[PDB]
Curated annotation (Swiss-Prot), chain A:
GO biological process annotation, one example: proteasome-mediated ubiquitin-dependent protein catabolic process
Function (record text): Component of the 26S proteasome, a multiprotein complex involved in the ATP-dependent degradation of ubiquitinated proteins. This complex plays a key role in the maintenance of protein homeostasis by removing misfolded or damaged proteins, which could impair cellular functions, and by removing proteins whose functions are no longer required. Therefore, the proteasome participates in numerous cellular processes, including cell cycle progression, apoptosis, or DNA damage repair. In the complex, PSMD11 is required for proteasome assembly.
Name of the protein: 26S proteasome non-ATPase regulatory subunit 11
Keywords recorded for this protein, A-Z: Acetylation, Cytoplasm, Isopeptide bond, Nucleus, Phosphoprotein, Proteasome, Ubl conjugation
Source organism (scientific name): Homo sapiens (Human)
Impact noted for substituting residue 91 to A: Does not affect phosphorylation by AMPK
Taxonomic path: Eukaryota, Metazoa, Chordata, Craniata, Vertebrata
Induction of synthesis: By FOXO4; expression in embryonic stem cells (ESCs) is mediated by FOXO4.
Post-translation changes: Phosphorylated by AMPK.
Quaternary context: Component of the 19S proteasome regulatory particle complex. The 26S proteasome consists of a 20S core particle (CP) and two 19S regulatory subunits (RP). The regulatory particle is made of a lid composed of 9 subunits including PSMD11, a base containing 6 ATPases and few additional components.
Curated annotation (Swiss-Prot), chain B:
Keyword Transferase recorded: no
Subunit structure: Component of the 19S proteasome regulatory particle complex. The 26S proteasome consists of a 20S core particle (CP) and two 19S regulatory subunits (RP). The regulatory particle is made of a lid composed of 9 subunits including PSMD6, a base containing 6 ATPases and few additional components.
Keyword field: Proteasome
GN (gene name): PSMD6
Protein's recorded name: 26S proteasome non-ATPase regulatory subunit 6
Curated annotation (Swiss-Prot), chain C:
InterPro entries: DSS1_SEM1 (IPR007834)
Main localization, broad class: nucleus
Subcellular location(s) of the protein: Nucleus
SMART domains in alphabetical order: DSS1_SEM1
Tissue expression per record: Expressed in limb bud, craniofacial primordia and skin.
Protein name in the entry: 26S proteasome complex subunit SEM1
Native source species: Homo sapiens
Oligomer and partners: Component of the 19S proteasome regulatory particle complex. The 26S proteasome consists of a 20S core particle (CP) and two 19S regulatory subunits (RP). The regulatory particle is made of a lid composed of 9 subunits including SEM1, a base containing 6 ATPases and few additional components. Belongs to the TREX-2 complex (transcription and export complex 2), composed of at least ENY2, GANP, PCID2, SEM1, and either centrin CETN2 or CETN3. Component of the homologous recombination repair (HR) complex composed of ERCC5/XPG, BRCA2, PALB2, DSS1 and RAD51. Interacts with the C-terminal of BRCA2.
Taxonomic lineage: Eukaryota, Metazoa, Chordata, Craniata, Vertebrata
UniProtKB/Swiss-Prot annotation, chain D:
Annotated compartments: Cytoplasm; Nucleus
Name assigned to this protein: 26S proteasome regulatory subunit 8
Function: Component of the 26S proteasome, a multiprotein complex involved in the ATP-dependent degradation of ubiquitinated proteins. This complex plays a key role in the maintenance of protein homeostasis by removing misfolded or damaged proteins, which could impair cellular functions, and by removing proteins whose functions are no longer required. Therefore, the proteasome participates in numerous cellular processes, including cell cycle progression, apoptosis, or DNA damage repair.
Record family assignment: Belongs to the AAA ATPase family.
Boundaries of the shown chain within the full protein: 308 to 357 of 406
Subunit structure: Component of the 19S proteasome regulatory particle complex. The 26S proteasome consists of a 20S core particle (CP) and two 19S regulatory subunits (RP). The regulatory particle is made of a lid composed of 9 subunits, a base containing 6 ATPases including PSMC5 and few additional components. Component of a complex with USP49 and RUVBL1. Interacts with PRPF19. Interacts with TRIM5. Interacts with NDC80. Interacts with PAAF1. Interacts, in vitro, with the thyroid hormone receptor (in a thyroid hormone T3-dependent manner) and with retinoid X receptor (RXR). Interacts with ERCC6.
Organism superkingdom: Eukaryota
Length: 241, 378, 40, 50
């Protein structure tokens, strides 16, 4: 229940400064802000920073609580795939302080973030399935990943040659008409992909001529030129009568 | 002191289109009659709803109690003016005299408004006038006074800033933009969102979320659409509480047309049962279609209507005349072949037509400065 | 003019141009498009 | 020692001093109307108008 969790988080906002010292609240409040907002899909890198700020407050607390705490933050590095904070965290003394079993399995999970590599990703997906169960939201984490990795693999095969047949290139992605080809059509709507397909002969042809410096810089000024005359129409009509 | 009577305005529209319930609308109106001392709310409803039987002395002892309350406000103006003060006497009488406008007809309206409009030294008391013309302009269908009072509120109170009652104009002018047809300024003035929070004049803010989301799916473009809801914080939690509204926004980005005939019909059901949307629900239907058809045809240069029947389930003769009456009206010009199951896009509208607006406006405009040049001499 | 022959002998109205096109074509329309669900 | 001219003591922050100095500097900002300027001035003993 997300609205109930926000109401529970809202009650923690006024309770943080209510008593004298939290003693630890805002550290957990920022962690709770990195959960509900993570389900709200507000922002990734900032929510990942809340797991980093909470990890700084996790120093000298119950180890069974800190051994499952790295399950959330290191899998968050898997969701983002571009946190840019990788080298900062994992190279520090605080992230490497845990030598235990489960965290060593998370050490290669944090390495799997630097891995990507679909063929490797589909493999470690089964090896890390034990850590997949502790994922708070299993759908949102791996769906955006695999959907982002889709077009990451799509831009690789379409790049070398301009036009591509859609029957052979879809055999690598295992299907054509159901979803994939509709996802490539959505990339045209998002401008990430420039090209057009052919349903009859099954060939995707990429063609682009984006720049036009003659039409755009002209018509915009002519429309502005109308505003120059319309504003002068007040001078014209008033001086005559 | 609006939402109780503002719901009576919803009761007026509740009786308008459907004839089914005349009892359900008159029971909560009598419950609104026994309080607030409403006279005109049940006077004009007496013609639309049932004529009874009898109200009369049952509600006449309330207007007699109003008469005792009206005469004590009249006794308040000459008794308090015996002393001297700034706005203390005249503001105390106008707020409750504008409440006497809530009793009935135009009597309390015109006597309170124009009398106290001169002495007011604050922009807040001048807006209470404008605020109470907008509520009676909501009750009665007259569009005259609601355009005039907002014009007076924009000159005096905007000088100048304010946090609250200036943002209410963005809601009211935004409600005027949604009352008439204005797509761009409506969603633009609705960007305040939770900054206005909830007020007696703002009713339920969740209903205001439904008002700003219906104008956002048209005027706000698809790149900007997903940009506002995703990146938005306070506007995101209010749409998440509504599963039907949130599913429509995610489906609009998902482009699946199987749920559009369902979800939009549910939205159209709300469009039918809401006031001021009666003349405007006819164009809104197909406007979201071309909004979905825009990105649709952009996918493939050659498209088959058999593939359209998949998501439409099953469009065959429906989209035939549909898309035909679109291109004929100048909405999403395209070439769709019949019995050959071929759609052609194109249309390269960034080349030929973009040069035409030059001489198009350059005809009537330049003709005006022609006659204007013939004025000299004589 | 006023000379010669002729002296002897947003808005919703602006939106009515598109609205009147709906009067003679496809109504508004909701109930009909709502019936298209169960038909096919 | 007030010699020779009108005697003006450099004002410390005062109740009536914090009331007018706050209302003037608040004209350049957008502030809510549900705020009480009387209590906020008394909650700041000492300090200064700056």
């Amino acid at each position: 229940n997300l609205p109930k969790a926000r109401a529970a988080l809202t009650s923690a906002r006024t309770t943080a400064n209510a008593i004298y010292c939290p003693p630890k609240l805002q550290a957990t409040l920022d962690m709770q802000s990195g959960i509900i907002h993570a389900a709200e899909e507000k922002d990734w890198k900032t929510a990942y920073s809340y797991f980093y700020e909470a990890f700084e407050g996790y120093d000298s607390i119950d180890s069974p609580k800190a051994i499952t705490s790295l399950k959330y933050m290191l899998l968050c590095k898997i969701m983002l795939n571009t946190p840019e904070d990788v080298q900062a965290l994992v190279s520090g003394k605080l992230a490497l302080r845990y030598a235990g079993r489960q965290t060593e399995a998370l050490k290669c999970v944090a390495q799997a973030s630097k891995n990507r590599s679909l063929a490797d990703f589909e493999k470690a997906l089964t090896d890390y399935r034990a850590e997949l169960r502790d994922d708070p939201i299993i759908s949102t984490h791996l769906a955006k990943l695999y959907d982002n990795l889709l077009e990451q693999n799509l831009i690789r095969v379409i790049e070398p040659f301009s036009r591509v047949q859609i029957e052979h290139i879809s055999s690598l992605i295992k299907l054509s008409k159901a979803d994939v080809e509709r996802k490539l059509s959505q990339m045209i709507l998002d401008k990430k992909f420039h090209g057009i397909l052919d349903q009859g002969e099954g060939v995707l042809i990429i063609f682009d001529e984006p720049p036009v410096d003659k039409t755009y810089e002209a018509a915009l000024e002519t429309i502005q030129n109308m505003s120059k005359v319309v504003d002068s129409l007040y001078n014209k009509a008033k001086k005559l009568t | 002191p609006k939402n109780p009577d503002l719901r009576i305005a919803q009761l007026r529209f509740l009786l308008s289109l459907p004839e089914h319930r005349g009892d359900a609308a008159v029971r909560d109106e009598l419950m609104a009659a026994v309080r607030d001392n409403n006279m005109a709310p049940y006077y004009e409803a007496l013609c639309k709803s049932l004529d009874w039987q009898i109200d009369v002395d049952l509600l006449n002892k309330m207007k007699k109690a109003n008469e005792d309350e009206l005469k004590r406000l009249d006794e308040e103006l000459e008794d308090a003016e015996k002393n001297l003060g700034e706005s203390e006497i005249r503001d105390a009488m106008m707020a409750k005299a504008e409440y006497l406008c809530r009793i009935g007809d135009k009597e309390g309206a015109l006597t309170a408004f124009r009398k106290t409009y001169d002495k007011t030294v604050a922009l807040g008391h001048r807006l209470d006038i404008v605020f109470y013309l907008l509520r009676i302009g909501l009750f009665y269908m007259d569009n005259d006074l609601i355009t005039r009072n907002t014009e007076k509120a924009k000159s005096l109170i905007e000088e100048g800033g304010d946090w609250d009652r200036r943002n209410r104009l963005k809601v009211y002018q935004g409600l005027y933009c949604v009352a008439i047809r204005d797509f761009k300024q409506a969603a633009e003035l609705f960007l305040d969102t939770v900054s206005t929070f909830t007020s007696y004049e703002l009713m339920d803010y969740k209903t205001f979320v439904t008002y700003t989301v219906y104008v956002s799916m048209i005027a706000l473009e698809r790149p900007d659409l997903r940009e506002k809801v995703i990146k938005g914080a306070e506007i995101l939690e209010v749409l998440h509480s509504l599963p039907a509204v949130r599913q429509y926004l995610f489906s609009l980005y998902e482009c699946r047309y199987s749920v559009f005939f369902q979800s939009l019909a549910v939205v159209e059901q709300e469009m039918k049962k809401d006031w001021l949307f009666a003349p405007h629900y006819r164009y809104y239907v197909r406007e979201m279609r071309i909004h979905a058809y825009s990105q649709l045809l952009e996918s493939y240069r050659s498209l088959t209507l058999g593939y359209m029947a998949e998501a439409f389930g099953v469009g065959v003769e429906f989209i035939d005349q549909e898309l035909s009456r679109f291109i004929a009206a100048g909405r999403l010009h395209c070439k769709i072949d019949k019995v050959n199951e071929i759609v052609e896009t194109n249309r390269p509208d960034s080349k030929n037509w973009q040069y035409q607006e030059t001489i198009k406006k350059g005809d009537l405009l330049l003709n005006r400065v022609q006659k204007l040049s013939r004025v000299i001499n004589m | 003019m006023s000379e010669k022959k002729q002296p002897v002998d947003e808005d919703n109205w602006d939106d009515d141009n598109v609205e009147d096109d709906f009067s003679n074509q496809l109504r508004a329309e909701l109930e009909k498009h709502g019936y298209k669900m169960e038909t096919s | 020692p007030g010699r020779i001219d009108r005697k003006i003591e450099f004002p410390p922050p005062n109740e009536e001093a914090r009331l007018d100095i706050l209302k003037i500097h608040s004209r350049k900002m957008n502030l809510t109307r549900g705020i009480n300027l009387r209590k906020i001035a008394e909650l700041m003993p000492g300090a200064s108008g700056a």
